[PDB]
Design a protein around this nucleic acid. Sequence first.
DNA 1: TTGACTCTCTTAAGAGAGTCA
DNA 2: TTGACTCTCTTAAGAGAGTCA
Lengths: 162, 162
Amino acid sequence: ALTNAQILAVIDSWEETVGQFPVITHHVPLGGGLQGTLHCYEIPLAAPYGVGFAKNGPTRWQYKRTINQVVHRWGSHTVPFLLEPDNINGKTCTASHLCHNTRCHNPLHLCWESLDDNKGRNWCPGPNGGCVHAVVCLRQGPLYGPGATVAGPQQRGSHFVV
Amino acid sequence: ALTNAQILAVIDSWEETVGQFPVITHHVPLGGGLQGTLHCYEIPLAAPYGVGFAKNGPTRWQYKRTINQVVHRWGSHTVPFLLEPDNINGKTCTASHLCHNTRCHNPLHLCWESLDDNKGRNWCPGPNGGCVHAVVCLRQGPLYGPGATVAGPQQRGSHFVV
DNA sequence: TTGACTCTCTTAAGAGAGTCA
DNA sequence: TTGACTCTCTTAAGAGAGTCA
Ligand SMILES: [Mn+2]
Ligand SMILES: [Mn+2]
Ligand SMILES: [Zn+2]
Ligand SMILES: [Zn+2]
Ligand SMILES: [Zn+2]
Ligand SMILES: [Zn+2]
């Protein structure tokens, strides 16, 4: 099995490579009518992506390193968390984008949590709008707001009470 | 079926049958430390479910009627909305449980909205905790809260900024 | 050892359609 | 005509593994 030193070396090589990705400045809602700035380190749209990186789906990538003649591969956003527990409350841990930018691989924009926790950030009011996430959101979720409901609760007769 | 009269007859038959489902009272968090009461009309756990109803999945049902000698079938929660547009902004409209209770078929607990709007209600703080849904939530979402994040944003080197 | 592709799978909110009696 | 089963599909947040040179 890979040693602690070996895993740290994988994380360090990943950081070195991702740090050279194009850095894009994005202005983002924080909640409470305030605006902030995030700096995303974005993987390229097409090959080549960077040393060790390859695309396995339209918005999915993997990182690969060969150690002692054994090929090791990980989801592209999971590498910062290789020394952390991989489950919690019986649920698999997932890489969660605090910046809501899939191509971004900035580890300061990622957290490690259940898929349910991950998804819910899409609707969070944000760090200046009432976020209660213990690991705080960096921005208001892109789907926060009144919504676009087409039809609300209703009945034609009198068979029901709320 | 095709006619408005036929569609109204389908909604009326569905309401009459669902109106005879057992009414189960559920006390629910509203947000803001307050509690409310919902009355769900719950489809039975096993056959028979009611005239026109059949189970197509562990928590999925369909409603079926014969009109002009042809069988017409719909997802069991979609019937109240048969006169509404079936899409919004190019996204499919879905039946969305304001009570977060799949077996419930009370139309006073359903709305018709995109899958994203639907999902997002799971994390809403609720009608007394800050819900901003234009079609208001009936309760705080079951997944609202601080989460259980295992690891937050972090780097080993000095290549990244927020 | 490495790059650039290929394929299918998970989850939890939701769907459509066919086989028998 | 009605009932009680069977199967796979959609979405958008996420995954693992194979092939070839
Ligand atoms: Mn996410
Ligand atoms: Mn729902
Ligand atoms: Zn980012
Ligand atoms: Zn948050
Ligand atoms: Zn209900
Ligand atoms: Zn709400």
